[PDB]
Design a binder for this molecule. Structure first.
Ligand code: NAP
Ligand code: NXK
Length: 313
C-alpha cells in the first residue's frame, strides 16, 4: 500500500504515525528515535501530553544526524482547550514549535471543539465536576487557526473529536478560508465510525484514527472493559494472516483510507507496528472487523458533558 495520502492542502501525509499520549518523558525520546530509524515519518503530539520537549529532542537529533530531512517528516500537534481565545492561539502554537525544535508544523489540530477558561490548569473544573468553559466558539477559533497558515507556522490545519454537525459548522463557516485537512477521531473495531468517516471523506477531509489498539494503558481502564488486543475473534484473523493482533488493528484503518497513529514506547513493538505494508485483510475480514462495533469510547471527555460544544451526545 502507498505510504502517504493526499490532503486538501496539496501536501502528502504518512498514513502510519507514532502516537505519544502517555509516553513517559524519560522514554519518549528513545521511542521517537527508534521510530524514525525503522521508517516512521509522522509523529502525533500535543501540548497537553506534557512531553513535546522530549519528542523534540529526538526529532532534532535525527535531523542533525541526517537520518531524515525535515521535508520528509510530518509532525502533528494540537491546540489545547484552554487556548481557544484569539489572543492565545499563536503563543500556544509557538510554544509547541519551540518544544518540538521546529519552525513549522505539518498539521495543527483543534484538540477538542470545547474551549475552557484560560489559565495554568488544563481542566478548570467547578464544584459539580464540570469544566469551566470559554465563551469562544469553534468558528472564531478556526479563524485563529487559519491565521497560523497565513503566518507560515503550520502547513495544514484541522480538527479533532468534532462530530458531524461540528465538521459541518466549520465547512459552513461564513468567510471560511481553509477547509480542515483532517479530523482526528477515535476509531477501532469497537467504535467503527462509519457515518462520521463517510461524511468527512465525502468532503475531502482525511480521517486519522486514534486509540487503534484500544488504548490498554489509558488511565481510567477498568478490568471489565472490552479489550481489542485480547479479543479471540481478532486474534483469529491475525493468526490466519501470520501477523500480530496489533498489526491487524493497524492495517484495518489503513484499508479504510484512514491515517492511524498507534502509540508505543517499546522498541520491539514500534518496529513490529510499522510492518503492516506487507499483507492485506480481505473484504470479508474488513466487514467482520466492522461488525464488532459497540460504540465504546476510550476518550469520552466526561468532565465536559454539559459544555455547549461537547461532541458525543
Ligand atoms: N486527538 C485526541 O483526542 C487523542 C486521544 C487519544 C489518543 N490520541 C493519539 O492517538 C495515539 C494512540 O492512542 P492511545 O495512546 O490512546 O492508544 P493505542 O495506540 O490504542 O494503544 C497504546 C497501548 O498499546 C500498547 N501497544 C502498542 N503496540 C503494541 C503491540 N504491538 N502489542 C501490544 N501492545 C501494544 C502500548 O504499550 P507500550 O507503549 O508500553 O509498548 C500502549 O499501552 C495517542 O498516543 C495520541 O497520539 C489522540
Ligand atoms: O485528549 C487526548 O488526546 C488524550 O486524553 C487526554 C490526554 C491528556 F494528556 C490529558 C487529558 C486527556 C483527556 O481527554 N482526559
Amino acid at each position: 500500500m502507498a505510504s502517504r495520502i493526499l490532503l486538501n492542502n496539496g501536501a502528502k501525509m504518512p498514513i502510519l504515525g507514532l502516537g505519544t499520549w502517555k509516553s513517559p518523558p524519560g522514554q519518549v525520546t528513545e521511542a521517537v528515535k527508534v521510530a524514525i530509524d525503522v521508517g516512521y515519518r509522522h509523529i502525533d503530539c500535543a501540548h497537553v501530553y506534557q512531553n513535546e520537549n522530549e519528542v523534540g529532542v529526538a526529532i532534532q537529533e535525527k535531523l542533525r544526524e541526517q537520518v531524515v530531512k525535515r521535508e520528509e517528516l510530518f509532525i502533528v500537534s494540537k491546540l489545547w482547550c484552554t487556548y481557544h481565545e484569539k489572543g492565545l492561539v499563536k503563543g500556544a502554537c509557538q510554544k509547541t514549535l519551540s518544544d518540538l525544535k521546529l519552525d513549522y508544523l505539518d498539521l495543527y489540530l483543534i484538540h477538542w471543539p470545547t474551549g475552557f477558561k484560560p489559565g495554568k490548569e488544563f481542566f478548570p473544573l467547578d464544584e459539580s465536576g464540570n469544566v469551566v468553559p470559554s465563551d469562544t466558539n469553534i468558528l472564531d477559533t478556526w479563524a485563529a487557526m487559519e491565521e497560523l497558515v497565513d503566518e507560515g507556522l503550520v502547513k495544514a490545519i484541522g480538527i479533532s473529536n468534532f462530530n458531524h454537525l461540528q465538521v459541518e459548522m466549520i465547512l459552513n463557516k461564513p468567510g471560511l478560508k481553509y477547509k480542515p485537512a483532517v479530523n482526528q477521531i477515535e476509531c477501532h473495531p469497537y467504535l467503527t465510525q462509519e457515518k462520521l468517516i463517510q461524511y468527512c471523506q465525502s468532503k475531502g477531509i482525511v480521517v486519522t484514527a486514534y486509540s487503534p489498539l484500544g488504548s490498554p494503558d489509558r488511565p481510567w481502564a477498568k478490568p471489565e472493559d472490552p479489550s481489542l488486543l485480547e479479543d479471540p475473534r481478532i486474534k483469529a484473523i491475525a493468526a490466519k494472516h501470520n501477523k500480530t493482533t496489533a498489526q491487524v488493528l493497524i492495517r484495518f484503518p489503513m484499508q479504510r483510507n484512514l491515517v492511524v497513529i498507534p502509540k508505543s514506547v517499546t522498541p520491539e513493538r514500534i518496529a513490529e507496528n510499522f510492518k503492516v505494508f506487507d499483507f492485506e485483510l480481505s473484504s470479508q475480514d474488513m466487514t467482520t472487523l466492522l461488525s464488532y462495533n459497540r460504540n465504546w469510547r476510550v476518550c469520552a471527555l466526561l468532565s465536559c458533558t454539559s459544555h455547549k460544544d461537547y461532541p458525543f451526545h
